[PDB]
């Protein structure tokens, strides 16, 4: 495995690779072990005060589940990286963020701005103090913890307008992260319009941890890391072994 | 039922149904204010009640609070494997929304091996912003599902206890006091005659909606809640109450 990690690192240009045992597509509990490893990676990188941006999805929900209070007692503020991506509440960044904060015995900020508001309603809402302040907090994140999905899988699960499904399909999206759909070369081919973190913003976040696994995600994971992301990947053998096959 | 004979529960249930306008009364032994395990027994009885009421397909609306949490903790899969979708009955708007019904909803659905849909948890926003959000198709779908609820399982609280437990605006605290609220259920505070005197700023189920819900199960007990329970049921609610001797004996004698 030491070798598997080193090879994955070089292939994907990662800051580091953390690989847990097994294939989460065959053994669901393996997702909880990715969660556990992610938490450990987070705690390695915390400073005295931390603003942690987090996405939704079931894998970051596993991070939240495995979260425990910080032993050194460092200060932790969690914020949802970006909302209004059309997920059911169980899968919203806003939900996962609150859950993680609770488990870490930290604090969190709520941010709910849904996907399909009118131009006027969207323009007005993002100027409201509670939103404006949280957007600023997200802008100054010291950490980002995010998932990676297959494009088709994400597009189906979310409430995706028909015209956008077409675009995602016609532009050969294969992977998705934080509301960006990318093709096989790591290029953006569809951006979901939503407030909060933008792709350009991630270069300003010193510690980024991606958490994604399962053999079925091998292609999505490879595609996402086709460009430099300055990111630590937590994955499992299922994804890593299939990617490197 | 030697048991419920000797413990006097069957006779107590009869009288409680005659006194309040109950669809049915289910009373477990003891006083949950004195004996915390009695809450777990209310949860047990409530779960059994739900299972007797389920149709082929169900949309079960739930409230938060420790009593419905105990219902969720006691929930087990349906041996008949009927279709079970759980939703929160309401969601909060305004400052520091916690949406604890969401918490209980997910917990109960997981225990039942059912499915669930939660309500959004907003930050502090203008009414205009809330009005825009409510019409958003994804949000609208959940509200429509709550509107189609086949069952409602809810707590009942003392008005003062709840207004104080919650992040209640000072203007609304004054209103609740000045209008002599004595009881609370699902985001509505009622006076001693069971009339609404204040409604929490929320989305989801409204009091007028409960008539259309075939099965409503209130779960609330302890001597401290006798006055609140009596007040809530001063008006007809077509509701099955699961409670304890603590509440029932104090109310009746
Ligand atoms: O069962 P408990 O702990 O006495 O709580 C009962 C109360 O909890 C609730 O069900 C839910 O409280 P919230 O609406 O603040 O989340 C109230 O409607 C009810 O008054
Ligand atoms: Cl495995
Ligand atoms: Cl463990
Ligand atoms: Cl979302
Ligand atoms: Cl949900």
Swiss-Prot record, chain B:
Subunit (UniProt): Homotetramer. Binds primarily as a dimer to each half-site of the full-length operator, with much higher affinity for the right site. Then, both dimers interact, bridging the two-half sites of the operator region.
Known role: In the absence of glucose, represses the transcription of the gapA operon, which encodes five key glycolytic enzymes. Binds specifically to the cggR-gapA promoter region and blocks the progression of the RNA polymerase, leading to the arrest of the transcription.
Domain remark text: Contains an N-terminal DNA-binding domain and a large C-terminal effector-binding domain. Contains two distinct sugar-binding sites with different affinities.
Keyword list, A-Z: DNA-binding, Repressor, Transcription, Transcription regulation
Alphabetized GO MF terms: carbohydrate binding; cis-regulatory region sequence-specific DNA binding
Record-level GO BP terms: regulation of DNA-templated transcription initiation
Organism from which the protein derives: Bacillus subtilis (strain 168)
Signal peptide (residue range): none
Amino acids binding beta-D-fructose 1,6-bisphosphate: 64-67, 90, 100, 165-166, 184, 225
Protein's name according to its UniProt entry: Central glycolytic genes regulator
């Amino acid at each position: 495995l030491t070798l598997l990690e080193k090879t994955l690192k070089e292939r994907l240009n990662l800051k580091d690779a953390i690989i847990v045992s097994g294939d989460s597509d065959q053994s669901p509990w393996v997702k909880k072990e990715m969660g556990r490893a992610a938490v450990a990676c987070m705690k390695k990188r915390f400073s005295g005060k931390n603003i942690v941006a987090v996405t939704g999805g079931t894998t970051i929900e596993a991070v939240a589940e495995m979260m425990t209070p910080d032993s050194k007692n460092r200060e932790l503020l969690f914020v949802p990286a970006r909302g209004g991506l059309g997920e059911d509440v169980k899968n919203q960044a806003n939900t996962i963020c609150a859950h993680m904060a609770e488990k870490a015995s930290g604090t969190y900020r709520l941010l709910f701005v849904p996907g399909q508001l009118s131009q006027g309603a969207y323009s007005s809402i993002i100027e409201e103090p509670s939103v404006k302040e949280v957007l600023n907090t997200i802008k100054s994140a010291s950490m980002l913890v995010h998932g990676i999905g297959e494009a088709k899988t994400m597009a189906q699960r979310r409430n995706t307008p028909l015209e956008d499904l077409k675009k995602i399909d016609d532009n050969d999206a294969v992977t998705e992260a934080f509301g960006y759909y990318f093709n096989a070369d790591g290029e953006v081919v569809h951006k979901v319009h939503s407030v909060g973190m933008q792709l350009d913003d991630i270069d300003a976040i010193p510690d980024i941890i991606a958490v994604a696994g399962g053999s079925s995600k091998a292609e999505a994971i490879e595609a996402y890391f086709k460009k430099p992301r300055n990111t630590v990947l937590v994955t499992d053998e299922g994804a890593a072994k299939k990617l490197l096959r």
